Design a protein around this nucleic acid. Structure first.
Ligand SMILES: [Zn+2]
Ligand SMILES: [Zn+2]
Ligand SMILES: [Zn+2]
Ligand SMILES: [Zn+2]
Lengths: 76, 146, 109, 95, 82, 101, 101, 98, 97, 85, 96, 109
DNA sequence: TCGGATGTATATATCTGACACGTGCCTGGAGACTAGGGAGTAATCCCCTTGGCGGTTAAAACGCGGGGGACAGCGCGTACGTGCGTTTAAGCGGTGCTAGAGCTGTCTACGACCAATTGAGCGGCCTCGGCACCGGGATTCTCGA
DNA sequence: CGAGAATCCCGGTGCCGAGGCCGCTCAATTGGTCGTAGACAGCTCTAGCACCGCTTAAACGCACGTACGCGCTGTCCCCCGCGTTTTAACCGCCAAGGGGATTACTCCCTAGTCTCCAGGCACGTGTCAGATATATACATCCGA
């Protein structure tokens, strides 16, 4: 479903992600839309981050929810 | 650098961010203090860590100085307290608020960036071992923070 | 007569259409100069000096000054990518250099 | 004796529109005079070549649009073409 | 007849010109190199600037003759006329 | 303010197209002139011309689709100020695919 | 790409609402749209980017470009100067009609 | 036991000093002696306007500062910190001067 | 069964093309570059045959001019292989980037 | 009656870039060069074809002639000898 | 009607037969020699026009082409072209 | 009349003094053109084509050919230090490159 | 991991000279008019640009193996940085001289402009010799040993 | 120190482009007049050169020690060379038609001229922005 994606500075993305999909599949869809690699991405729900092996159905993530993106710049 | 700070306090009192809090020390609207509640996926359970936030008086067009007052063993964090982020150092924008900075600090405690450390001898055993710092981060945070 | 107005007020400009027309005549560019040709130059020359004095006047307020100094002209020009392409083979006298230290030279953490 | 013409009167008139409270020192008015003098010779220099290339003896506003499009980079050329044609179409109406 | 004035461009003056360039360390063989580069630069500009005075039948070298000699070499000054 | 209630009658022409005369749905703006229309308005219209239908500023020299970018924030003003278009767009869309699988 | 699909090619304009209907506007609903993300206040003299279509104040972008790096501060894209921005007067009248004065 | 900065910190302090200022960095009387040596090979008993020598100071120092910005790039490319006379010759050849 | 050392056929090819004056880039897939890039400026542009051949001899002469200047960047970094670091010095000292 | 010309930069083949490097006198060529010299040909060709088309837009022609390329290159300080002028 | 395009092709053959009376030039290298001559008009008459503007004169004389040659031609190309240009002008004070 | 001779034979030249004079008139350089001005240009333009066709004709004899090819024009020009200073921003079509391999690339002894 | 030392930004008062404004005068721009030719327009020819087949074969593409070169680490040593103390001469400011720049005025020789004339140089046509290509055999680096 | 691709050298065929010829128009030459650009001479006075004295900023010389340039070693990735297969460039041919040249005609636009007057320039004057000095407080570097 349409889940909005917030960033730190304010990019908003319309993702069509089913709740059956895993969290790594959510990362791989931001590959094809903005070029961002998944190995830099963080994803936060109200204090709790997302593990890689889980899905979006564990946290009761309903329709029209918000993500958060924090970029892990490997080297600075 | 005076009127936008009044509305950040509206942005922190109406909806305070998770595992976070902030506010001024006193009459000075350029020296702030903040706390961090430790996350549960991290080896930082039983969190509280204090902060100091200094405004360069051309805010929001110069990155603020945020340092640690409590000692934290973590590869991208000095023994003096300065945080090694690419946000507050190089890649910064005037559209970032402190409430977005605190969520970028809270996410350092779960997973760091082990490719550019500050004390480089700490980040060596992260790259080879995993069972050591799971205990070290639980010993040195129950003493100097709890 | 009918109270001579100017050409540059008929164009809504401030750069002189009368001087530009006789600097195109005297100056050996062509045999003839069209009537709308100094109106076009005087409009382009306004809105290239207006676009520098915007940016130079903003750089004077950052240094808390009320006069434009030739420091502020290079801070205006060498911070645009498009005023650097006009003025890349141009040295501004007493303008200085943009402060740029490269990251290899800075001390290690 | 021997009065000398410059563009100094008109740079102050463009200041008082843009920043009505700032001024310019005399060493930077001498630099703004050489911006204007050295962009005549760029634009009128290539507008004269276009008349010789096309075997014409007039420099019109059609040949100053393209000298601007050749010389000015990117969006300097878009805003100076648009504000050079707004002066010609305002000139030819008020005659 | 003047002699030995290239050495009046001293060592600490080249280190100031290097530190608007952004140079931390300077090897000791550079000061003889950059004096030889100012020779070649000034000999090219003064040669053209004098042939503008020779053409105008004039015995002083004016400020515009330097500006036209520099504009000819693709280095236009703003601030001294033109 | 705190409420600042308003009528639709003063909020019509900032939510109306010209090529259809209706509310913006998938609104795209021209980069040069910043006049907004629907996606099914401009993409049809700039198959024939290279000019904005409001102010006749040339969109692009050859292919006017390069200087068209969709404005997400102007849609979100249209869905919020008008009662029930995010449903009524989907209800018109879901009834379309009910006959065309 | 700007390829229209099947529903885009066979859709109808949704008409206006001309009957007088009050809109209960709430200021807890229009934050990310009418507010400048630099000064955290209402948008005034709005300048939108070309490539990104993000709205700021006029005196906030020009200060953000010369006192920082040359990017859109909400996209990290490439801005060059103030002339890679366009003022939107069709957006300024949304604030002057919803929130006067 | 007396105060002593590490080598490199005063040098970075001077880079920030001179990239902030706009004055001329060569002394003005030994520069006039150059201009009046080099011009002796082209005419004799030449005179110079006072702004004709100052036009040559603005042009020469902008030329040399522009070189040292390019000899940095030739020294950092070779993984060094010192500029060397290798680096002047390499920047001056790619420009089309040698 | 028979192999030259790596670097000896490379020195043969330096001597072949520094003697010849032919166009090294092809000719049909480079009318297609010229006609893609010109699609953004006018529609339905025709080209003279000598207008495309003036563009190949300009573009080859200034890529060969680059690689002469990116040797010098590779050799002064004490290398033999050119890296894309070397194109970036050569285009920055020239004043292109 | 164009549709679109699609890619055509991959037609600058890797053996064609190795020939151009060996008039430059290059022994060894890393594999990341071929992706970048295609991007430098874009910037050479886009700058010349901007100017060469604006000489034909205003001569009111539809063919880009050989002189319009010669004047576009002379305007950039890269003069051709052998095509007129 | 072909417009009778002028070139310097007749005059480059006449300078060959002085210099190398047994060699020729292909047509592609005549178009290059026609481009040398046209692009050195533009340089010399370009700077001779500026020397008249700088000194507030309306004539280009042989004085302004001596100094345009001295500005443009490098080194010993300038000395041999100044001498061989004044030898042709002084075949008018004796031959009018 | 008196049997029209030419101007270029009075100058002892072969480049046309008559064309140079009307390319200085038509061409917008100055209002007036002196009489000794096309005589000076036509003499300078001879003895720059004579100095190239000397060196290009010598490079044709080294390749055992009797026609000058644009290979021989770049072998003439890029081997002078003074014809490189005129023609340093000039590409000669089908002229090629001087053969220069640098000594680091040559195989070790 | 810290306190002394040095350097930095910051605030305040004083002071000078350069900016900005004003005034008077003159010369350059505007208004009005006329005349001639440059350019815009229409019609027409025919060149040359595009487009499409088809056969051939040079050149790209792909894959495999192995050696050379990039790159990181390490140790040695010397050359550059920092700094103090002593020497030099730049900088200022002042006075005095005169070369030469800059202007004015008179006058002539030079160049534009014109009309008539005629021969140089352009375009088209024709032809033979330089140069490319083929093919056979000398022969010169290259590399394993 | 021989084997094997590769480079040169030579003798022969074959074609097409250079070089010469010719008819002819248009551009250069002759001859002449006319107004003005520039050469020339005199004179004013600005500013460039020369000298002097004093203050003190900056250059110079020296010593010491750190850290960076540079040579050496080793490991491994990644280019080169080569052989095989596949793609499409290249060539020649044919055909259609857009559009580049070219002409002829006509009219609007620009130069040129005369007059009139106001905008801009030189010159003068007074006040405030900026520079300098002082005295802070705070930031930053570094040995212990
Ligand atoms: Zn619509
Ligand atoms: Zn529009
Ligand atoms: Zn954006
Ligand atoms: Zn704002």
């Amino acid at each position: 479903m349409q889940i909005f994606v917030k960033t730190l500075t304010g990019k908003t993305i319309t993702l069509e992600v089913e709740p059956s999909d895993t969290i790594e599949n959510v990362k791989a869809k931001i590959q094809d839309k903005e070029g961002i690699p998944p190995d830099q991405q963080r994803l936060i729900f109200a204090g709790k981050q997302l593990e890689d092996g889980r899905t979006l159905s564990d946290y009761n993530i309903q329709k029209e929810s918000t993500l958060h993106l924090v970029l892990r710049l490997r080297g600075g | 650098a005076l009127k936008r700070i009044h509305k950040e306090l509206n942005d922190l009192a109406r909806d305070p961010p998770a595992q976070s809090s902030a506010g001024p020390v006193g009459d000075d609207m350029f020296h702030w203090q903040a706390t961090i509640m430790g996350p549960n996926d991290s080896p930082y359970q039983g969190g509280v860590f204090f902060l100091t936030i200094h405004f360069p008086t051309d805010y929001p067009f110069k990155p603020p100085k945020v340092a640690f007052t409590t000692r934290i063993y973590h590869p991208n964090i000095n023994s003096n307290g300065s945080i090694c982020l690419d946000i507050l150092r190089s890649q910064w924008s005037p559209a970032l608020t402190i409430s977005k900075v605190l969520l970028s600090i809270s996410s350092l405690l779960s997973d760091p960036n082990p490719d550019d450390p500050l004390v480089p001898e700490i980040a060596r055993i992260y790259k080879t071992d995993r069972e050591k710092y799971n205990r070290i981060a639980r010993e040195w945070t129950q003493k100097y923070a709890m | 007569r009918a109270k001579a107005k100017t050409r540059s007020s008929r164009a809504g400009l401030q750069f002189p259409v009368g001087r530009v027309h006789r600097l195109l005549r005297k100056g050996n560019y062509s045999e003839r100069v069209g009537a709308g040709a100094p109106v076009y130059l005087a409009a382009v020359l306004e809105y290239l000096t207006a676009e520098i004095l915007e940016l130079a006047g903003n750089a004077a307020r950052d240094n808390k000054k009320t006069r434009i100094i030739p420091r502020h002209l290079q801070l205006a020009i060498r911070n645009d990518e498009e005023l650097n392409k006009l003025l890349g083979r141009v040295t501004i006298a007493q303008g200085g250099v943009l402060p740029n230290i490269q990251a290899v030279l800075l001390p290690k953490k | 004796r021997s009065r000398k013409e410059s563009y100094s009167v008109y740079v102050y008139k463009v200041l008082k529109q843009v920043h009505p409270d700032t001024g310019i020192s005399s060493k930077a008015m001498g630099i703004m005079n050489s911006f204007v003098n050295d962009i005549f010779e760029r634009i009128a220099g290539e507008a004269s070549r276009l008349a010789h290339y096309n075997k014409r003896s007039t420099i019109t506003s059609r040949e100053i649009q393209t000298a601007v499009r050749l010389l000015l980079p990117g969006e300097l050329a878009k805003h100076a073409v648009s504000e050079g044609t707004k002066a010609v179409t305002k000139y030819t109406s008020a005659k | 007849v003047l002699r030995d004035n290239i050495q009046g461009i001293t060592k600490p003056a080249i280190r100031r010109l290097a530190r608007r360039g952004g140079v931390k360390r300077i090897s000791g063989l550079i000061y003889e190199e950059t004096r030889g580069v100012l020779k070649v630069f000034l000999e090219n500009v003064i040669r053209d600037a004098v042939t503008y005075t020779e053409h105008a039948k004039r015995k002083t070298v004016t400020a515009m003759d330097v500006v036209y000699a520099l504009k000819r070499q693709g280095r236009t000054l703003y601030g001294f006329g033109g | 303010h705190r409420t600042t209630r308003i009528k639709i009658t003063e909020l019509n022409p900032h939510l109306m197209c010209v090529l259809c005369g209706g509310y913006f749905i998938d609104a795209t703006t021209i980069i040069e002139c910043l006049h907004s229309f629907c996606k099914t308005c401009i993409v049809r219209y700039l198959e024939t011309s290279k000019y904005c239908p409001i102010c006749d500023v040339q969109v692009h020299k050859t292919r006017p689709l390069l200087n068209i970018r969709s404005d997400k924030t102007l849609q979100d003003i249209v869905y919020k100020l008008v009662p029930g278009l995010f449903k009524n767009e989907m209800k018109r869309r879901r009834d379309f695919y009910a006959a065309h699988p | 790409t700007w390829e229209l699909s099947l529903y885009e090619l066979q859709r109808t304009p949704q008409e206006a609402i001309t009957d007088g209907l009050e809109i209960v506007v709430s200021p807890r609903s229009l934050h990310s749209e009418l507010m400048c993300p630099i000064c955290l206040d209402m948008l005034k003299n709005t300048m939108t980017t070309k490539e990104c279509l993000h709205r700021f104040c006029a005196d906030c972008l020009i200060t953000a470009l010369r006192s920082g790096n040359k990017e859109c501060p909400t996209c990290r894209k490439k801005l060059v100067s103030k002339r890679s921005l366009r003022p939107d007067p069709n957006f300024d009248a949304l604030i002057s009609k919803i929130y006067p004065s | 036991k007396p105060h002593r900065y590490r080598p490199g910190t005063v040098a970075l302090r001077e880079i920030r000093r001179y990239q902030k200022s706009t004055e001329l960095l060569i002394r003005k009387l030994p520069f006039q002696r150059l201009v009046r040596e080099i011009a002796q090979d082209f005419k004799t008993d030449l005179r110079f306007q006072s702004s004709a020598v100052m036009a040559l100071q603005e042009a020469c120092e902008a030329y040399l500062v522009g070189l040292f910005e390019d000899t940095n790039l030739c020294a950092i490319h070779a993984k060094r910190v010192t500029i060397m006379p290798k680096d002047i010759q390499l920047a001056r050849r790619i420009r089309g001067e040698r």
